[PDB]
Design a protein around this ligand. Structure first.
Ligand SMILES: Nc1ncnc2c1ncn2[C@@H]1O[C@H](COP(=O)(O)OP(=O)(O)O)[C@@H](O)[C@H]1O
Ligand SMILES: Nc1ncnc2c1ncn2[C@@H]1O[C@H](COP(=O)(O)OP(=O)(O)O)[C@@H](O)[C@H]1O
Ligand code: VO4
Ligand code: VO4
Ligand SMILES: [Mg+2]
Ligand SMILES: [Mg+2]
Ligand SMILES: [Mg+2]
Ligand SMILES: [Mg+2]
Ligand SMILES: [Mg+2]
Ligand SMILES: [Mg+2]
Ligand SMILES: [Mg+2]
Ligand SMILES: [Mg+2]
Ligand SMILES: [Mg+2]
Ligand SMILES: [Mg+2]
Ligand SMILES: [Mg+2]
Ligand SMILES: [Mg+2]
Ligand SMILES: [Mg+2]
Ligand SMILES: [Mg+2]
Ligand SMILES: [Mg+2]
Ligand SMILES: [Mg+2]
Ligand SMILES: [Mg+2]
Ligand SMILES: [Mg+2]
Ligand SMILES: [Mg+2]
Ligand SMILES: [Mg+2]
Ligand SMILES: [Mg+2]
Ligand SMILES: [Mg+2]
Ligand SMILES: [Mg+2]
Ligand SMILES: [Mg+2]
Ligand SMILES: [Mg+2]
Ligand SMILES: [Mg+2]
Ligand SMILES: [Mg+2]
Ligand SMILES: [Mg+2]
Ligand SMILES: [Mg+2]
Ligand SMILES: [Mg+2]
Ligand SMILES: [Mg+2]
Ligand SMILES: [Mg+2]
Ligand SMILES: [Mg+2]
Ligand SMILES: [Mg+2]
Ligand SMILES: [Mg+2]
Ligand SMILES: [Mg+2]
Ligand SMILES: [Mg+2]
Ligand SMILES: [Mg+2]
Ligand SMILES: [Mg+2]
Ligand SMILES: [Mg+2]
Ligand SMILES: [Mg+2]
Ligand SMILES: [Mg+2]
Ligand SMILES: [Mg+2]
Ligand SMILES: [Mg+2]
Ligand SMILES: [Mg+2]
Ligand SMILES: [Mg+2]
Ligand SMILES: [Mg+2]
Ligand SMILES: [Mg+2]
Ligand SMILES: [Mg+2]
Ligand SMILES: [Mg+2]
Ligand SMILES: [Mg+2]
Ligand SMILES: [Mg+2]
Ligand SMILES: [Mg+2]
Ligand SMILES: [Mg+2]
Ligand SMILES: [Mg+2]
Ligand SMILES: [Mg+2]
Ligand SMILES: [Mg+2]
Ligand SMILES: [Mg+2]
Ligand SMILES: [Zn+2]
Lengths: 48, 553
RNA sequence: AAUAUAUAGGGUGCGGGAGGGAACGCGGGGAAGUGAAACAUCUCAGUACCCGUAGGAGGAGAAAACAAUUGUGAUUCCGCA
RNA sequence: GCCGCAGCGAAAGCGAGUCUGAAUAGGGCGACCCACACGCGCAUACGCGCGUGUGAAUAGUGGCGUGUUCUGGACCCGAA
RNA sequence: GGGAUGAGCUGUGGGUAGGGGUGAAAGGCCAAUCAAACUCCGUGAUAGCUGGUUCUCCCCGAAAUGCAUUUAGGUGCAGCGUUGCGUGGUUCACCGCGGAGGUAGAGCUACUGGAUGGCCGAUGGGUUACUGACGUCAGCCAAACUCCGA
RNA sequence: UACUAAAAACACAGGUCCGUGCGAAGUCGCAAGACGAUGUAUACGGACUGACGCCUGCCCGGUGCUGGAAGGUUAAGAGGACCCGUUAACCCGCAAGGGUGAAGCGGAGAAUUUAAGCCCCAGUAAACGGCGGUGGUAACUAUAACCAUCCUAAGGUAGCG
RNA sequence: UCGGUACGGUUUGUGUAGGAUAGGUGGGAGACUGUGAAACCUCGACGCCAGUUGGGGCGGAGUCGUUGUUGAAAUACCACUCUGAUCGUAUUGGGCAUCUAACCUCGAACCCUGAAUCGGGUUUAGGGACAGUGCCUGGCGGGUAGUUUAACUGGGGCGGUUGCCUCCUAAAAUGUAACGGAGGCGCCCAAAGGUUCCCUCAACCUGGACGGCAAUCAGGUGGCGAGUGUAAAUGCACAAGGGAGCUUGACUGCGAGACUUACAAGUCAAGCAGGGACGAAAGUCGGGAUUAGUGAUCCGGCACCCCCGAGUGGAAGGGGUG
RNA sequence: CGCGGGGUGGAGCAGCCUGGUAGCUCGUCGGGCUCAUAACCCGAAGGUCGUCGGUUCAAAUCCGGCCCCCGCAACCA
RNA sequence: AACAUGU
């Protein structure tokens, strides 16, 4: 019901962060602006 | 032994609802596979892996090299351009820009450097003889005469539900992908567009999948049934009369096997409550087998179905709907011309006609969303009107299936009574935490069930059914037609399903236009079986074609 | 010989084998107690025991070897690593 | 041959430094006598860095005793 | 005391062997030993268990608690003992000062509950001598009550 | 039960079931070979019952045993698409690197094809086993021949207490 | 006999004008000696997209090309072969049937054999590529073998309990046992997080269409009795309670110093740099008022970094960081 | 005393695991059929889901506290 | 094939 999703970047596709969401309140893939250490700046992050 | 598509241990699941689990099958070219199953079985989730739109969780699923994949979605989208521009974005999409550059290099190269652009038009003019793409003006004019498309100069925002599906089939039958993925193709198509597509998919190079609920289209375009039960896939052969045999047999040998397990729990639960005697021990190796039998007896508890239930309305008078000399159109084309009828009390009326002929416009003058040209529509003081719609315009995607029926409210009105809202939607199959799915993730078979929950809560004694037999399977198609026969008011049905108007009808209103009038209708007093015998005695005795190839190859 | 070519077999004449020995050698079969604070993989251990067969010793031994850009040059055994 | 004589790092490797890190940021681990006048761009005074020493205190390794310890029956006696 | 011409008794010679034999069946019997004989060997089997461990004297001197444990009569580490080298009053006792508390007691019209007798009477019960909510005047109670407080 | 139990315990003649078509089934042995038996279904081995008399009811759901093969599931062998490692050759090139890559040899190997078994389909209780609750009802009380209902594969018959 | 593959014959394709529309490509101006308008034959392959693509009977009288155009393209004839059909040969598998020669016979006779119910050999009567046996492989398997089957406990068994979080017992720091007294947990939230601004609750009383003890309104009174996603305690009206705007700090690289502690763990943290959110700024932000919502090591899985690469270049494998 | 099952209209039972709509057969009540009664046919009434108090928008159901009924263990000396 | 009874 609350699986562990992982957040891949949108430029480099590195998998920088891991967190949990609710599957039934949020059926789509989450999008957050998170810091990417490869790019050195805040990028966008969908899930996988 | 050369293949098209292979699945290796694919397991896609939306948590508790598994769709595949440890499946493996291979698709070879020339195969004609029709995929069946109940509503919500997972049939469109398989084709969204086979088209590369979704990814399986833990498995391998890949197309072979070459032989690209074109999918017909269950709700096919279009663009905001014309019809002739609606067929070039696919089928001609990778090849018209190679002609959009050749008519550019005829003039831009003549004033620039003529040495490096010699091969820039060289590697593109040799891409116009292997495909014969010079006739792109007149290949589109052949593919529209086959499907009987609308005229290709008007926009596509105001089209029929079965005219948008004709221009979406032309986007795929021109591409000719070697793996077709048709998701419910016979929705909204008349008895001509289905009979055409049976002959076109008969002699077709490549693999064809088609998730078709209907009993007669799959007997013509398929010879190898694929099935989806709760997770598994059962490939075999037959012509869909053997699918209802095997699903009836797979539940009679699973149903009584799960009854022998229930008697062995009662014989064993009596042992674990019987108390240890003198200094003997109750064995741990029987407690640990009871709690494995008691765990494998709760995982089999998915056996339920909800019937279609229409609320009854107030008393219906002697005058239901009267139509006197109705004329209706939008342009120089006239749809309805000089129509006179009156809806009976306590009957089922069927509206019959091909696509784009004026059937949804006939309801939208009755419900008060249009305006007649000449003649009037007259209702009466008793009638409360209930109207389901073809377009499903009431349901919005980014809102859950509960709080579209309700609006965050607990108790709703379904016509002079107050039933609870979650008790109302669970009477429409949406049970438990399936009540929090939004409308974008619901299947097509349960947006034809959610639309019946939005609009039948008006509780009226006149229901207008605008294609209700659209995405429903055989179990709930019979549950709908058994809810119209027991309905006390009057029900009006638009449908293309020949074996659905034959079963539940009392009156027929059918289009009978010909070449000199093109806009006349006909009111008949009787069932559908007596209409087809009268149709072949009034107009054209034994007269009421050859397959247009859509291409020169 | 049966039965024909012949063989199995039988007659005669010279050699050889057999069994014992305390340890050591080679080849083959192969435990459990035990240790694992229980136990089955694992250990104990290829130990105890058994079988075949020697010799004054036995086995191995004359590269279808190692090594790493140079090179060592049959085997066994002792010391290191 | 063994122990000592340089450490740090997963390693490549660098080496009184090194690993991490974008960092001449901070930590980890390692190295480094100001008891000493003097000389130095020291100074209200102690110091900072480097010479001159007043010639500061490091140090390991091999044997033989002892106390524990490891592998062997391992302090001795005793099963079913 | 039972059988005593029988499924009898007995002599001489022989056959069956150890997870095997034999059994008119008792786990009976297989050399006074049998829910798996005896002897040699592995072998000085192992035992968180009981027993034992030998000459003297001088200095100091415990513990039976914590935590973990297929652990609870066992054991690892800490606590407490001795001794070697460092550190040198840092330990401890008293006096003065700087500080946190909510026990004892007490209080409750300061809260949450319990509860005694008056008074006023919403309601409930048949127009009312029965019920007496909430309020108020007095007297009280509390390990999981506290405006307080050694 | 030598050595605390001689009995109601074992045996028994009679009974029924099941196995066995003949170097049989069964047993002793790795095997050869032997017993069975110098026998041949009125014979031999197993299981239960235990002279005789009258009798031996109902239940095939469970677990066995016997038969069956339409369907599902299922091993090694056969098969070897597809993807991967190597590099002849080739391209952009700083020719310090990258990219596409034939054949051969490899690594990992899918579809397909395939028996018994198990699921499945029946039979069998002198096969191992199993043979019900609750409430009302008659000329005084009492008891129910009778009835209602729920459940089961079947609801304990003759006899006895 | 039923299939697979390789090879070859015959045959198949018809939206719209048309020679029912060579199917594709390439060659091509000839090809046969001409009546599906024929005589025995005469679509009874398919027969539908119907008449051209056969029942190959014969005839040197009797069709068709190129031109004409009528089209994306043509017209005969033919090698070239895609989709489907059928025929033939070759080479390979699977069924079934027959054979005999391997193998089998405790059926019979004869010899070695003087004495032989053993054994061996010869011959005959049968069985037969099966059976048996080797190797690989599924099944079945208390027939047999090795073992396991926890502890606490007012004896043991039976019943209950085992880790985490809050209170009381607990004797006014911390800690403290019992099968002592009460309760919670194995989550939830994409806002219920971050920030900036703004507001005060419950209960009671008076007036009001439906409307009642209590829905929404209006006014008095009300300093915490409401509220806190969830148990209890400690907190919170300065709000940590209610509402709104923009948002992702539910960050990457760290960490002076502490708490707690046998050890393993647990917990708090000023501040420094990167790149951000909100704010006019000051500043605040490394999830949630706080304390539960979890599992050491080993063995593995995946993503990325390109550290090692068993002669060398790679690779297989290993290593780091999440 | 301890385990663990039960209470639903006059009688018998579902519904309970998986929360929203109280059902089934008989009986009672009114009307038919018949000379009359049973049988049968038609229409109806009847529930505080043992009791109260929490979770929830909502409880017969989920969770605790009580009041009755039924079954089962109580062994080794 | 409906199909019992009348102290
Ligand atoms: N994105 C999603 N997230 C969660 N649940 C989904 C999603 N998509 C589908 N489902 C669930 O899984 C089921 C599968 O839908 P599906 O059966 O593939 O549609 P169709 O009936 O058209 O094949 C649906 O009934 C739906 O309830
Ligand atoms: N708003 C409009 N304006 C113009 N034409 C319309 C509009 N709506 C529908 N039409 C035309 O009316 C024709 C008939 O539609 P109709 O048959 O009523 O739809 P349905 O098939 O759903 O009944 C369609 O061809 C469509 O082009
Ligand atoms: O185009 V329609 O199927 O709604 O007639
Ligand atoms: O593919 V459906 O089961 O939604 O008609
Ligand atoms: Mg949301
Ligand atoms: Mg669908
Ligand atoms: Mg329509
Ligand atoms: Mg000898
Ligand atoms: Mg052992
Ligand atoms: Mg051990
Ligand atoms: Mg031990
Ligand atoms: Mg010699
Ligand atoms: Mg030698
Ligand atoms: Mg090192
Ligand atoms: Mg440093
Ligand atoms: Mg006597
Ligand atoms: Mg006597
Ligand atoms: Mg006598
Ligand atoms: Mg003897
Ligand atoms: Mg004896
Ligand atoms: Mg033994
Ligand atoms: Mg030993
Ligand atoms: Mg000992
Ligand atoms: Mg002393
Ligand atoms: Mg100690
Ligand atoms: Mg003081
Ligand atoms: Mg004080
Ligand atoms: Mg306190
Ligand atoms: Mg007190
Ligand atoms: Mg009080
Ligand atoms: Mg009082
Ligand atoms: Mg107190
Ligand atoms: Mg005796
Ligand atoms: Mg035999
Ligand atoms: Mg017999
Ligand atoms: Mg028997
Ligand atoms: Mg007996
Ligand atoms: Mg007998
Ligand atoms: Mg049966
Ligand atoms: Mg029977
Ligand atoms: Mg009984
Ligand atoms: Mg009786
Ligand atoms: Mg055993
Ligand atoms: Mg052992
Ligand atoms: Mg114990
Ligand atoms: Mg006790
Ligand atoms: Mg304290
Ligand atoms: Mg104290
Ligand atoms: Mg916020
Ligand atoms: Mg707030
Ligand atoms: Mg997180
Ligand atoms: Mg730190
Ligand atoms: Mg900053
Ligand atoms: Mg700003
Ligand atoms: Mg901070
Ligand atoms: Mg919390
Ligand atoms: Mg381990
Ligand atoms: Mg190498
Ligand atoms: Mg690698
Ligand atoms: Mg790091
Ligand atoms: Mg009546
Ligand atoms: Mg006793
Ligand atoms: Zn990035």
């Amino acid at each position: 019901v609350r699986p562990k999703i992982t957040l891949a970047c949108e430029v480099c596709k590195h998998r920088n962060y891991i967190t949990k969401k609710n599957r039934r309140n949020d059926p789509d893939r989450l999008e957050l602006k998170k810091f990417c250490p490869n790019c050195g700046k805040h990028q966008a992050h969908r899930e996988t | 032994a050369e293949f098209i598509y292979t699945m290796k241990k694919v397991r896609k699941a939306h948590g508790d609802k598994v769709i595949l689990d440890d499946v493996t099958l291979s698709f070879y070219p020339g195969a004609k596979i029709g995929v069946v199953g109940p509503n919500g079985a997972g049939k469109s989730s398989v084709l969204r892996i086979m088209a590369g739109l979704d990814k399986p969780n833990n498995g391998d699923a890949f197309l072979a090299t070459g032989a690209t994949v074109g999918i017909l979605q269950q709700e096919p989208p279009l663009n905001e351009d014309k019809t002739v521009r609606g067929n070039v974005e696919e089928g001609m999409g990778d090849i018209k820009i190679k002609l959009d550059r050749f008519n550019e290099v005829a003039e831009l190269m003549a004033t620039d450097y003529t040495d490096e652009l010699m091969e820039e038009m060289g590697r593109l003019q040799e891409e116009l003889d292997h495909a014969d793409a010079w006739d792109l003006d007149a290949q589109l004019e052949q593919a529209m005469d086959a499907l009987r498309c609308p005229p290709a100069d008007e926009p596509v925002t105001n089209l029929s539900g079965g005219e948008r599906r004709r221009v979406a089939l032309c986007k795929l039958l021109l591409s000719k992908p070697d793996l077709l993925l048709l998701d419910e193709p016979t929705n909204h198509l008349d008895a001509e567009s289905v009979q055409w597509l049976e002959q076109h998919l008969a002699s077709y190079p490549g693999a064809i999948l088609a998730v078709t609920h209907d009993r007669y289209f799959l007997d013509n375009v398929a010879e190898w049934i694929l099935e989806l039960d709760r997770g598994r896939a059962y490939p075999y052969e037959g012509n869909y009369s053997t699918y209802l045999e095997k699903k009836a047999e797979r539940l009679a040998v699973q149903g009584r096997k799960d009854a022998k397990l229930q008697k062995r729990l009662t014989e064993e639960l009596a042992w674990v409550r019987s108390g240890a005697k003198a200094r003997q021990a109750k064995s741990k190796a029987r407690l640990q087998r009871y709690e494995e039998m008691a765990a494998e007896a709760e995982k089999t508890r998915k056996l339920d179905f909800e019937e279609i239930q229409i609320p009854v309305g107030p008393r219906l008078g002697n005058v239901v709907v009267e139509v006197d000399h109705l004329d209706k159109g939008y342009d120089g084309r006239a749809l309805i011309k000089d129509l006179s009828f009156s809806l009976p009390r306590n009957g089922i009326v069927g509206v019959i006609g091909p696509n784009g002929v004026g059937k949804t416009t006939l309801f939208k003058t009755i419900v008060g969303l249009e305006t007649p040209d000449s003649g009037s529509v007259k209702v009466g003081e008793t009638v409360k009107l209930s109207y389901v719609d073809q377009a499903r315009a009431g349901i919005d995607p980014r809102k859950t299936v509960w709080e579209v029926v309700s609006d965050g409210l607990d108790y709703i009105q379904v016509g002079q009574t107050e039933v609870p809202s979650r008790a109302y939607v669970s009477a429409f199959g949406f049970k438990g935490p399936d009540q929090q799915k939004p409308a974008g993730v619901l299947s097509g078979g349960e947006r034809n069930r959610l639309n019946l929950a939005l609009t039948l809560k008006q509780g009226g004694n006149l229901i207008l059914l605008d294609e209700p037999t659209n995405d429903l399977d055989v179990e709930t198609l019979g549950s709908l037609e058994n809810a119209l026969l027991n309905f006390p008011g009057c029900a009006v049905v638009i449908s293309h399903d020949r074996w659905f108007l034959d079963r539940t009808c009392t009156h027929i209103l059918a289009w009978e236009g010909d070449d000199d009038n093109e806009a006349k209708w006909f009111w008949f007093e009787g069932n559908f079986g007596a209409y087809e015998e009268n149709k072949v005695e009034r107009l054209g005795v034994d007269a009421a074609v050859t397959h247009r190839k859509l291409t020169r190859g």
